[PDB]
Design a binder for this molecule. Structure first.
Ligand code: HEM
Ligand code: HEM
Ligand SMILES: Cc1cc(N)nc(CCc2cc(N)cc(CCc3cc(C)cc(N)n3)c2)c1
Ligand SMILES: Cc1cc(N)nc(CCc2cc(N)cc(CCc3cc(C)cc(N)n3)c2)c1
Ligand SMILES: [Cl-]
Ligand SMILES: [Cl-]
Ligand SMILES: [Cl-]
Ligand SMILES: [Cl-]
Ligand SMILES: [Zn+2]
Ligand SMILES: [Zn+2]
Ligand SMILES: [Zn+2]
Lengths: 407, 411
């Protein structure tokens, strides 16, 4: 009931009591840990509503108050009659902030309370969606001084009138299978690109083509829109010491904006809820550039560096990795676009985690995702024991809409 | 039940059925994953099923399941348990068991090697002097003048829990640590507590940065005794860098033989509380953990200073640059001295090949991602994007309390 986590570097031991409020399943059992698996009615709805409203009212120190009891009754009455209910703006904001607070895979959560929430529940069409998104992009980007934001479109009703952003991120690069056999641009986006082309997009067929938005309103067929090119802030990548680096012709976008997840607040399901923050440098320099299924540039970089690539034991891959990540951070910093390096981000996280343990009784964290994809051991999260469990409100995965959508 | 794992780099999907043989607990529940938690006198009644499970596995493995020899062995073990409360393993069973404990070790990236383990049966040992002699032979054999060979030495099993064999050292070879009055540490901070015990026991400490600890050995539940491993048996590598000539002057070296001596080996329900086992190093164990952990030799700052990196802000990645250079140095040094070592790219590539083979031939390969992914450059190794399933198979290696906490002193 009281669970201990130890830091193996500092010997500090912390006690978790918050896990007793865990609700969804982890995927693990007493027999098998699924910690490294990436994806492991009115009747149902009122309990979830009550659970949420209780935590809300507690948070504003009005638990058991008349206003609390009246609100619970109101929602009971609304579900009984309408089969769903509507969140107050205050509840929406609290819910969205807490879904981020509860995101056990996010190292960036020290920031959770400063989230700007844009209520787009009045949106009715795809063109409406496009306007809201352009506004979110411009607000979040803020000329390179990035601010966290989320935009919340209308909730699911009967599941046949869903709002969805078909893009996995608001901003991402196209991917094209070539006659050659290789891939041009981002291999991660090959399927989505094809769908854009099949829906009508005139693809430029280049290496860094910002994809169009494919937007679905009210369960209708999705529609194509181009984000105003002047709202997409991009950074050309150069190195502070290697002059040949710019010649690789690399760039990335400044705004990471996840658009394919589902937000659950008090049983209500927000299927379109794009949210954005700013990048940790390794996300671009390790994952996006160096994964074998992504831009896969390690070999090209190592070649230009004149490293001995005969044997793995020369650590050429590791040298090239560091330099690529130096270049990313240098480029963003020189262009004054917000970015955080993995040492700074994980140090901030450990501070946030300690605050959370003392003020809230715990901080669910998924070590597999919290430890950065390079230099793990020399960051303060590596030696930190974590407990992973699911709290609501939450962000959840959901299937890609092209499998689901009835055309 | 069939469980699928995916590789996110290759899209290759494997199917695990071996999890159906899982026994002990993970620490996890449907509500809480304890995947990142480091640590999450048996009755006759519990013992025979454990014995039987094991002997069934052993006899299937030799393709004699259900044979007369199999049935006779079950009956022979059953009666032995009835009349003595325990039983003795045959040598073949002990060998099989020890190899399987390694094969089942979910935190071990080196498991491609599991079937090539030299097993030294020390079950006839009765004294700490006898233990010392067995351990010297193990070290000499495994070291093999730098051409390292995997080995385990198995001392007598637990009986009543009052007569345990223990190696009090956490590894057979490890460097002393000395906490100074000023609060600094000379040598390896991981071994301060054990060093103090050795000193208390009568060890004359050289008080240097790399003093090889004496062995502290307990036989048959007696008080442990001190022994110095012959210096000529301790193979060490001075650490230098292929391009930086000042690296050697940091004064670093490390021992070639990683030999874990504090774990418990469980086979067929029997408990082997002294079972030191050794392989060879992956480079990051020395370069990342032993050298660069803050609670260890903590050399990152000193190295980065000598490299003249911009240390004013973490975003220069000065820490990461120094880390790579230190690890290059460790691999270069071992390779130059012809002492076996494996780099993390090679070790993880071999492990993935091992893992896929295990899925194909065995129905699974329990693996602990937190441990399998190397402590640097995780994502560019082929294990990072590999989904794994962690579960406990027996035979197994287990943690046990440090013996100074539990031992009843005879004086
Ligand atoms: C403000 C700066 C932010 C930073 C630096 C940050 C950092 C990260 C990183 C690094 C990861 C995944 C691990 C990796 O890529 O190496 C992640 C995951 C995640 N983040 Fe954050 N984040 C930030 C803002 C946000 C915001 C504003 C939200 C929502 C409001 C959010 C929600 C999530 C969720 C749900 C995941 C897991 C995604 C998944 O399961 O695929 N993050 N974050
Ligand atoms: C032969 C070469 C070997 C290599 C390269 C190797 C490598 C490793 C590494 C790298 C780890 C932990 C991850 C890390 O330290 O960064 C580990 C853990 C482990 N190894 Fe292996 N190993 C080898 C041989 C063996 C042998 C012979 C055994 C026993 C028969 C063994 C049993 C284990 C066990 C039980 C663990 C988990 C330790 C714990 O939980 O504290 N290994 N090994
Ligand atoms: C809002 C926000 C801001 C910010 N800076 N970063 C994010 C996360 C974005 C993200 C996007 C993708 N496509 C993949 C991952 C890791 C995918 C992954 C991780 C691990 C640890 C293993 C694996 N197989 N895949 C993370 C969100
Ligand atoms: C036989 C053998 C051969 C060989 N080459 N290596 C080993 C493992 C040795 C080992 C020894 C210690 N003290 C700690 C760890 C990991 C400690 C650790 C790992 C992680 C992932 C987290 C954490 N907190 N601590 C591993 C055994
Ligand atoms: Cl990304
Ligand atoms: Cl990834
Ligand atoms: Cl070690
Ligand atoms: Cl460690
Ligand atoms: Zn688990
Ligand atoms: Zn990746
Ligand atoms: Zn460490």
């Amino acid at each position: 009931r009281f669970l201990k986590v130890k830091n193996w570097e500092t010997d500090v031991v912390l006690t978790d009591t918050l896990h007793l409020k865990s609700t969804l399943e982890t995927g693990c059992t007493e027999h098998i840990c699924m910690g490294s698996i990436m994806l492991p009615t009115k009747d149902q709805l009122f309990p979830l509503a009550k659970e949420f409203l209780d935590q809300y009212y507690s948070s504003i120190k009005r638990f058991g108050s008349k206003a609390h009891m009246d609100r619970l009754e109101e929602v009971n009455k609304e579900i009984e009659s309408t089969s769903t209910y509507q969140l107050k703006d205050t509840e929406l904001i609290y819910g969205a902030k807490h879904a981020w607070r509860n995101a056990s895979r996010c190292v960036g959560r020290i920031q959770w309370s400063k989230l700007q929430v844009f209520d787009a529940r009045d949106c009715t069409t795809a063109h409406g969606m496009f306007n809201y998104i352009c506004n979110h992009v411009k607000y979040a980007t803020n000329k390179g001084n990035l601010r966290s934001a989320i935009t919340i479109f209308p909730q699911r009703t009967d599941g046949k009138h869903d709002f969805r952003v078909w893009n996995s991120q608001l901003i991402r690069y196209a991917g094209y299978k070539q006659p050659d056999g290789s891939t041009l641009g981002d291999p991660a986006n090959v399927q989505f690109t094809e769908i854009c082309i099949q829906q009508g997009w005139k693809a430029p067929r280049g290496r860094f083509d910002v994809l169009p938005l494919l937007l679905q309103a009210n369960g209708n067929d999705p529609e194509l829109f181009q984000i105003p090119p002047e709202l997409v802030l991009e950074v050309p990548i150069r190195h502070p010491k290697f002059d040949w680096f710019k010649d690789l012709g690399l760039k990335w976008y400044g705004l990471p904006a996840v658009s394919n997840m589902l937000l659950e607040i008090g049983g209500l399901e927000f299927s379109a809820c794009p949210f954005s923050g700013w990048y940790m440098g390794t996300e671009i320099g390790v994952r996006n550039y160096c994964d074998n299924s992504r831009y896969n540039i390690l070999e090209e970089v190592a070649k230009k560096m004149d490293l001995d690539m005969r044997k793995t034991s020369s650590l050429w891959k590791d040298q090239a990795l560091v330099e690529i990540n130096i270049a990313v951070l240098y480029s963003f910093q020189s262009d004054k676009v917000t970015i955080v390096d993995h040492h700074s981000a994980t140090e901030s996280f450990i501070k946030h985690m300690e605050n959370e343990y003392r003020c809230r009784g715990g901080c669910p964290a998924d070590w597999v995702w919290i430890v950065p994809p390079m230099s793990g051991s020399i960051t303060p999260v590596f030696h930190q024991e974590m407990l992973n469990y699911r709290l609501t409100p939450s962000f959840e995965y959901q299937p890609d809409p092209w499998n689901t959508h009835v055309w």
